[PDB]
PDB file of C-alpha atoms and ligand atoms in Angstrom:
ATOM      1  CA  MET A 183      70.641   9.450  -0.154  1.00  0.00           C
ATOM      2  CA  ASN A 184      67.505  11.460  -0.737  1.00  0.00           C
ATOM      3  CA  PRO A 185      67.079  14.065  -3.452  1.00  0.00           C
ATOM      4  CA  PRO A 186      64.836  17.035  -2.696  1.00  0.00           C
ATOM      5  CA  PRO A 187      61.146  16.103  -2.809  1.00  0.00           C
ATOM      6  CA  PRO A 188      59.203  16.981  -5.958  1.00  0.00           C
ATOM      7  CA  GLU A 189      58.246  20.648  -6.225  1.00  0.00           C
ATOM      8  CA  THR A 190      54.806  21.637  -4.961  1.00  0.00           C
ATOM      9  CA  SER A 191      55.048  25.167  -6.330  1.00  0.00           C
ATOM     10  CA  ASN A 192      56.735  26.690  -9.378  1.00  0.00           C
ATOM     11  CA  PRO A 193      56.348  30.360 -10.260  1.00  0.00           C
ATOM     12  CA  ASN A 194      57.295  29.646 -13.906  1.00  0.00           C
ATOM     13  CA  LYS A 195      54.317  27.317 -14.245  1.00  0.00           C
ATOM     14  CA  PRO A 196      50.748  28.576 -14.590  1.00  0.00           C
ATOM     15  CA  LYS A 197      48.165  27.651 -11.957  1.00  0.00           C
ATOM     16  CA  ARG A 198      44.607  26.515 -12.524  1.00  0.00           C
ATOM     17  CA  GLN A 199      41.495  25.401 -10.693  1.00  0.00           C
ATOM     18  CA  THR A 200      38.788  23.229 -12.236  1.00  0.00           C
ATOM     19  CA  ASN A 201      35.799  21.258 -10.998  1.00  0.00           C
ATOM     20  CA  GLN A 202      37.670  18.048 -11.790  1.00  0.00           C
ATOM     21  CA  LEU A 203      40.751  19.149  -9.855  1.00  0.00           C
ATOM     22  CA  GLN A 204      38.638  20.104  -6.854  1.00  0.00           C
ATOM     23  CA  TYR A 205      37.050  16.658  -7.000  1.00  0.00           C
ATOM     24  CA  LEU A 206      40.463  15.005  -7.238  1.00  0.00           C
ATOM     25  CA  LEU A 207      41.380  16.607  -3.908  1.00  0.00           C
ATOM     26  CA  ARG A 208      38.063  16.505  -2.030  1.00  0.00           C
ATOM     27  CA  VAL A 209      36.924  13.056  -3.123  1.00  0.00           C
ATOM     28  CA  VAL A 210      39.628  11.016  -4.836  1.00  0.00           C
ATOM     29  CA  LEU A 211      42.762  11.840  -2.859  1.00  0.00           C
ATOM     30  CA  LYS A 212      41.106  12.339   0.500  1.00  0.00           C
ATOM     31  CA  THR A 213      39.255   9.022   0.251  1.00  0.00           C
ATOM     32  CA  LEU A 214      42.305   7.024  -0.962  1.00  0.00           C
ATOM     33  CA  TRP A 215      44.253   8.583   1.900  1.00  0.00           C
ATOM     34  CA  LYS A 216      42.065   6.765   4.432  1.00  0.00           C
ATOM     35  CA  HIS A 217      42.514   3.324   2.875  1.00  0.00           C
ATOM     36  CA  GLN A 218      44.374   0.779   5.054  1.00  0.00           C
ATOM     37  CA  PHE A 219      47.100   0.449   2.395  1.00  0.00           C
ATOM     38  CA  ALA A 220      47.655   4.198   1.845  1.00  0.00           C
ATOM     39  CA  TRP A 221      50.411   4.728   4.425  1.00  0.00           C
ATOM     40  CA  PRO A 222      53.485   3.777   2.333  1.00  0.00           C
ATOM     41  CA  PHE A 223      52.385   6.344  -0.244  1.00  0.00           C
ATOM     42  CA  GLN A 224      51.549   9.339   1.976  1.00  0.00           C
ATOM     43  CA  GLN A 225      55.023  10.915   1.798  1.00  0.00           C
ATOM     44  CA  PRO A 226      58.163  10.794  -0.348  1.00  0.00           C
ATOM     45  CA  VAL A 227      60.229   7.644   0.074  1.00  0.00           C
ATOM     46  CA  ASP A 228      62.932   8.362   2.644  1.00  0.00           C
ATOM     47  CA  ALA A 229      65.779   6.085   1.564  1.00  0.00           C
ATOM     48  CA  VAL A 230      67.706   6.661   4.794  1.00  0.00           C
ATOM     49  CA  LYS A 231      64.767   5.935   7.117  1.00  0.00           C
ATOM     50  CA  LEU A 232      63.506   2.962   5.100  1.00  0.00           C
ATOM     51  CA  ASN A 233      66.985   1.601   4.322  1.00  0.00           C
ATOM     52  CA  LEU A 234      66.408   1.644   0.565  1.00  0.00           C
ATOM     53  CA  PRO A 235      69.784   3.048  -0.479  1.00  0.00           C
ATOM     54  CA  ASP A 236      69.104   2.370  -4.166  1.00  0.00           C
ATOM     55  CA  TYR A 237      65.580   3.823  -4.250  1.00  0.00           C
ATOM     56  CA  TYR A 238      66.539   6.970  -6.128  1.00  0.00           C
ATOM     57  CA  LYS A 239      69.149   5.125  -8.139  1.00  0.00           C
ATOM     58  CA  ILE A 240      66.205   3.242  -9.638  1.00  0.00           C
ATOM     59  CA  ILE A 241      63.333   5.733  -9.491  1.00  0.00           C
ATOM     60  CA  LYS A 242      64.053   8.935 -11.418  1.00  0.00           C
ATOM     61  CA  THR A 243      60.558  10.437 -11.333  1.00  0.00           C
ATOM     62  CA  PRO A 244      59.446   9.889  -7.702  1.00  0.00           C
ATOM     63  CA  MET A 245      55.892  10.706  -6.689  1.00  0.00           C
ATOM     64  CA  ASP A 246      53.714  10.253  -3.634  1.00  0.00           C
ATOM     65  CA  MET A 247      50.285  11.297  -2.357  1.00  0.00           C
ATOM     66  CA  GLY A 248      51.667  13.860   0.084  1.00  0.00           C
ATOM     67  CA  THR A 249      53.183  15.697  -2.866  1.00  0.00           C
ATOM     68  CA  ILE A 250      50.002  15.313  -4.915  1.00  0.00           C
ATOM     69  CA  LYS A 251      47.892  16.640  -2.033  1.00  0.00           C
ATOM     70  CA  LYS A 252      50.114  19.721  -1.718  1.00  0.00           C
ATOM     71  CA  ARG A 253      50.061  20.288  -5.481  1.00  0.00           C
ATOM     72  CA  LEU A 254      46.252  20.156  -5.475  1.00  0.00           C
ATOM     73  CA  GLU A 255      46.053  22.480  -2.458  1.00  0.00           C
ATOM     74  CA  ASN A 256      48.386  24.931  -4.198  1.00  0.00           C
ATOM     75  CA  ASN A 257      46.611  24.822  -7.588  1.00  0.00           C
ATOM     76  CA  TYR A 258      49.896  23.648  -9.101  1.00  0.00           C
ATOM     77  CA  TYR A 259      48.194  21.611 -11.835  1.00  0.00           C
ATOM     78  CA  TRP A 260      46.772  22.888 -15.112  1.00  0.00           C
ATOM     79  CA  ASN A 261      44.184  20.114 -15.317  1.00  0.00           C
ATOM     80  CA  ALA A 262      42.902  16.809 -13.948  1.00  0.00           C
ATOM     81  CA  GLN A 263      44.873  14.725 -16.434  1.00  0.00           C
ATOM     82  CA  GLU A 264      48.112  16.233 -15.157  1.00  0.00           C
ATOM     83  CA  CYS A 265      47.206  15.218 -11.608  1.00  0.00           C
ATOM     84  CA  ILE A 266      46.073  11.757 -12.761  1.00  0.00           C
ATOM     85  CA  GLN A 267      49.494  11.293 -14.391  1.00  0.00           C
ATOM     86  CA  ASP A 268      51.126  11.863 -10.991  1.00  0.00           C
ATOM     87  CA  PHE A 269      48.995   9.127  -9.386  1.00  0.00           C
ATOM     88  CA  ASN A 270      49.916   6.779 -12.252  1.00  0.00           C
ATOM     89  CA  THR A 271      53.611   7.610 -11.892  1.00  0.00           C
ATOM     90  CA  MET A 272      53.326   6.798  -8.180  1.00  0.00           C
ATOM     91  CA  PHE A 273      51.780   3.402  -8.876  1.00  0.00           C
ATOM     92  CA  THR A 274      54.175   2.481 -11.675  1.00  0.00           C
ATOM     93  CA  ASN A 275      57.170   3.540  -9.560  1.00  0.00           C
ATOM     94  CA  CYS A 276      56.070   0.983  -7.019  1.00  0.00           C
ATOM     95  CA  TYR A 277      55.825  -1.762  -9.646  1.00  0.00           C
ATOM     96  CA  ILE A 278      59.223  -0.741 -11.020  1.00  0.00           C
ATOM     97  CA  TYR A 279      61.122  -0.576  -7.716  1.00  0.00           C
ATOM     98  CA  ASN A 280      59.740  -3.855  -6.409  1.00  0.00           C
ATOM     99  CA  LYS A 281      58.568  -7.126  -7.963  1.00  0.00           C
ATOM    100  CA  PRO A 282      55.261  -8.893  -8.622  1.00  0.00           C
ATOM    101  CA  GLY A 283      53.587 -10.347  -5.559  1.00  0.00           C
ATOM    102  CA  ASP A 284      55.435  -8.211  -3.002  1.00  0.00           C
ATOM    103  CA  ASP A 285      53.283  -6.923  -0.131  1.00  0.00           C
ATOM    104  CA  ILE A 286      54.111  -3.342  -1.152  1.00  0.00           C
ATOM    105  CA  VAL A 287      53.000  -4.120  -4.707  1.00  0.00           C
ATOM    106  CA  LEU A 288      49.742  -5.700  -3.487  1.00  0.00           C
ATOM    107  CA  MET A 289      49.111  -2.436  -1.639  1.00  0.00           C
ATOM    108  CA  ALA A 290      49.718  -0.287  -4.707  1.00  0.00           C
ATOM    109  CA  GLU A 291      47.550  -2.642  -6.805  1.00  0.00           C
ATOM    110  CA  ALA A 292      44.608  -2.268  -4.419  1.00  0.00           C
ATOM    111  CA  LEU A 293      44.991   1.507  -4.317  1.00  0.00           C
ATOM    112  CA  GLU A 294      45.217   1.721  -8.098  1.00  0.00           C
ATOM    113  CA  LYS A 295      41.956  -0.192  -8.502  1.00  0.00           C
ATOM    114  CA  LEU A 296      40.193   2.128  -6.072  1.00  0.00           C
ATOM    115  CA  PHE A 297      41.744   5.150  -7.786  1.00  0.00           C
ATOM    116  CA  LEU A 298      40.461   3.989 -11.174  1.00  0.00           C
ATOM    117  CA  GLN A 299      36.991   3.376  -9.718  1.00  0.00           C
ATOM    118  CA  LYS A 300      36.870   6.949  -8.485  1.00  0.00           C
ATOM    119  CA  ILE A 301      38.231   8.690 -11.591  1.00  0.00           C
ATOM    120  CA  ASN A 302      36.065   6.629 -13.959  1.00  0.00           C
ATOM    121  CA  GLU A 303      33.569   9.444 -13.669  1.00  0.00           C
ATOM    122  CA  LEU A 304      34.587  13.019 -12.906  1.00  0.00           C
ATOM    123  CA  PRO A 305      32.349  16.108 -12.597  1.00  0.00           C
ATOM    124  CA  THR A 306      31.741  18.157 -15.751  1.00  0.00           C
ATOM    125  CA  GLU A 307      33.473  21.536 -16.168  1.00  0.00           C
TER     126      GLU A 307
HETATM  127  O1  1A9 B1419      56.329   4.469   3.997  1.00  0.00           O
HETATM  128  C1  1A9 B1419      56.701   3.868   4.998  1.00  0.00           C
HETATM  129  C2  1A9 B1419      56.424   4.365   6.380  1.00  0.00           C
HETATM  130  C3  1A9 B1419      55.581   5.588   6.382  1.00  0.00           C
HETATM  131  C4  1A9 B1419      55.144   5.971   7.769  1.00  0.00           C
HETATM  132  C5  1A9 B1419      53.898   5.247   8.186  1.00  0.00           C
HETATM  133  C6  1A9 B1419      53.338   5.742   9.479  1.00  0.00           C
HETATM  134  C7  1A9 B1419      54.387   6.030  10.512  1.00  0.00           C
HETATM  135  C8  1A9 B1419      55.794   5.618  10.190  1.00  0.00           C
HETATM  136  C9  1A9 B1419      56.240   5.746   8.763  1.00  0.00           C
HETATM  137  N1  1A9 B1419      57.426   2.649   4.913  1.00  0.00           N
HETATM  138  C10 1A9 B1419      57.829   1.960   3.729  1.00  0.00           C
HETATM  139  C11 1A9 B1419      58.571   0.817   3.946  1.00  0.00           C
HETATM  140  C12 1A9 B1419      59.018   0.052   2.886  1.00  0.00           C
HETATM  141  N2  1A9 B1419      59.750  -1.138   3.171  1.00  0.00           N
HETATM  142  S1  1A9 B1419      58.971  -2.347   3.978  1.00  0.00           S
HETATM  143  O2  1A9 B1419      59.716  -3.592   3.948  1.00  0.00           O
HETATM  144  O3  1A9 B1419      58.799  -1.896   5.371  1.00  0.00           O
HETATM  145  C13 1A9 B1419      57.360  -2.689   3.333  1.00  0.00           C
HETATM  146  C14 1A9 B1419      56.904  -3.928   2.738  1.00  0.00           C
HETATM  147  C15 1A9 B1419      55.466  -3.791   2.352  1.00  0.00           C
HETATM  148  C16 1A9 B1419      54.959  -2.505   2.688  1.00  0.00           C
HETATM  149  S2  1A9 B1419      56.138  -1.609   3.377  1.00  0.00           S
HETATM  150  C17 1A9 B1419      58.715   0.438   1.591  1.00  0.00           C
HETATM  151  C18 1A9 B1419      57.978   1.592   1.374  1.00  0.00           C
HETATM  152  C19 1A9 B1419      57.652   1.990  -0.015  1.00  0.00           C
HETATM  153  C20 1A9 B1419      56.817   3.101  -0.408  1.00  0.00           C
HETATM  154  S3  1A9 B1419      56.742   3.132  -2.104  1.00  0.00           S
HETATM  155  C21 1A9 B1419      57.702   1.794  -2.361  1.00  0.00           C
HETATM  156  O4  1A9 B1419      58.032   1.281  -3.430  1.00  0.00           O
HETATM  157  N3  1A9 B1419      58.090   1.338  -1.167  1.00  0.00           N
HETATM  158  C22 1A9 B1419      57.514   2.356   2.435  1.00  0.00           C
END
């Protein structure tokens, strides 16, 4: 069973655009998206499709790059750190749901390294 995907809009929450957020979409996300190991992370985990009936029994704060992309496109975030936290939640979810050495974990590990490389330096405000 699948819960609703994470919100990509919220009228109670203030919107913002910054140079760093623009960069997170244009450069960081859109480059990671093209990586050979990006595909498991491009949409919310579908526990019915993927036959992971316990996915959402284990993962209580799901996150994926499809959601992050939409949030960035919608100016959902206040700042870059908020967006960066979503990427980190996505990676840690993978390490939590699986186990060390798994192919899926090797994929997340490679993506996380590339992610860190790209956010090491962000544009100035
Ligand atoms: O995301 C997908 C498919 C996305 C999509 C890709 C393009 C077209 C068809 C489906 N599969 C998938 C399978 C699987 N199960 S798997 O055995 O096929 C697998 C093992 C190593 C990589 S995927 C897991 C996960 C997963 C994402 S986060 C997490 O912790 N797990 C994802």
